[PDB]
Ligand binder design. Structure first.
Ligand SMILES: COC1=C2C[C@@H](C)C[C@H](OC)[C@H](O)[C@@H](C)/C=C(\C)[C@H](OC(N)=O)[C@@H](OC)/C=C\C=C(/C)C(=O)NC(=CC1=O)C2=O
Ligand SMILES: COC1=C2C[C@@H](C)C[C@H](OC)[C@H](O)[C@@H](C)/C=C(\C)[C@H](OC(N)=O)[C@@H](OC)/C=C\C=C(/C)C(=O)NC(=CC1=O)C2=O
Lengths: 213, 213
């Protein structure tokens, strides 16, 4: 059974700003995702310096992108530290974030949306291309859980009994907007990664499905 | 919680024959898989001729092959009719199969293992390349279940709360033997499909993971 939580009030305004004031350079949503994935991977690796067993739930360190064009879904998986239920609730919307108001004021004064990660709120850039998001996460210290939002004022957290097991880490599952289906394409993905994600210490894999001809 | 079932006694001998008398032309295991997938897809499509709603749990008709080299696993998914719990128990080992004994006698007299599907027992050819198998299946008339065997005299059936949801159909998950890892390779898979699976009415997709370079 899901629990429902209410977003802290400036997070709700930030999301509705991102959905509705919008327009240009939406592709930076993937740079923010990859940069969060890389932060999560840095954390497990640093953690494991003095607790090597932490690594054993998923020994390989990677970022993987899987288009699912039939569901209009883009998934980005990392094998980073992952998040517990309580981390999903606290850190993904119930507690105020330090740069939320400041980024909104920056935006209104003319700042590029691209600055969003410098405000510590770049996760919310995913609503540029998606009207719905699931974050499926598995921390070594908890069970697998699904966080879900349609950017509507509330989110749900649900013990995961429906998705593949990740050994450890997170899957970001974007239900893309009908106008943003270009991010389902191999060539577009590669261009965006090569443009804004050149210096990443982890391998970035792309999963492509082709017909045997 | 899993239930355990015992294999009918000639199925156990067939499996241990396949594991141990062996040697040559192991690649026909994929022709048998694809041919079963195609039979399952024919059945849903025929069924839907007079009950079109059956199709709506998974509108696309396909066979998909996904190597997972890090787990030494080959998955083959179809969106065919799927099987209920009771069909997995009955049809995947507890009840005697008509050609089991006859195929064993044919084999001993010198028959090519390749004849196995002409005896109606070709599912068991997967133990040529795998020491363990899961069949994860979702029929419109039941929940998702996992059947599992290590070819040891018994199998388990378990309500699925750990794998991705299939809308409808089956995933064959092969834990390949260390000597049979060639079936993890894109080029080998394609050769085997092109050789023995030329006339298939459904698209066969291959899922390939590559590093963004
Ligand atoms: C310092 O780390 C970062 C923080 C502080 C805090 C949340 C860290 C978090 O604590 C529980 C974990 O330490 C860390 C492993 C999890 C992230 C990197 C997640 O990424 C994935 N792939 O796990 C990302 O997932 C949706 C979650 C929230 C982001 C908020 C809404 C924001 O937008 N920006 C941030 C980007 C960051 O790099 C941020 O606030
Ligand atoms: C006539 O159909 C076939 C039968 C008769 C009977 C089992 C049919 C089954 O009834 C419940 C469903 O109608 C059908 C949709 C399911 C299969 C095609 C499955 O394939 C997948 N992809 O679903 C395959 O899965 C592991 C299962 C068992 C095979 C036994 C051990 C054997 O080896 N060979 C057979 C190959 C066949 O084509 C066989 O006995």
């Amino acid at each position: 059974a899901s629990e429902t939580f209410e977003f802290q009030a400036e997070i709700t305004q930030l999301m509705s700003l991102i959905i509705n004031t919008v327009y240009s350079n939406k592709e930076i949503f993937l740079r923010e995702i990859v940069s969060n994935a890389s932060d999560a991977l840095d954390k497990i690796r640093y953690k494991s310096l003095s607790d090597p067993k932490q690594l054993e739930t998923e020994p390989d360190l990677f970022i993987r992108i899987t288009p699912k064009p039939e569901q209009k879904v883009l998934e980005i998986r990392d094998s980073g530290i992952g998040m517990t239920k309580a981390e999903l609730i606290n850190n993904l919307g119930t507690i105020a974030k330090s740069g939320t108001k400041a980024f909104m004021e920056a935006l209104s004064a003319g700042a590029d949306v691209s600055m969003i990660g410098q405000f510590g709120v770049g996760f919310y850039s995913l609503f540029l291309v998606a009207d719905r998001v699931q974050v499926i996460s598995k921390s070594n210290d908890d069970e697998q859980y699904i966080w879900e939002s349609n950017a509507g004022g509330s989110f749900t957290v649900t013990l995961d009994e429906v998705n593949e097991r990740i050994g450890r880490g997170t899957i970001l599952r974007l239900f893309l907007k009908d106008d943003q289906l270009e991010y389902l394409e191999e060539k577009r993905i590669k261009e965006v990664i090569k443009r804004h994600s050149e210096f990443v210490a982890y391998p970035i894999q792309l999963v492509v499905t082709k017909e045997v001809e």
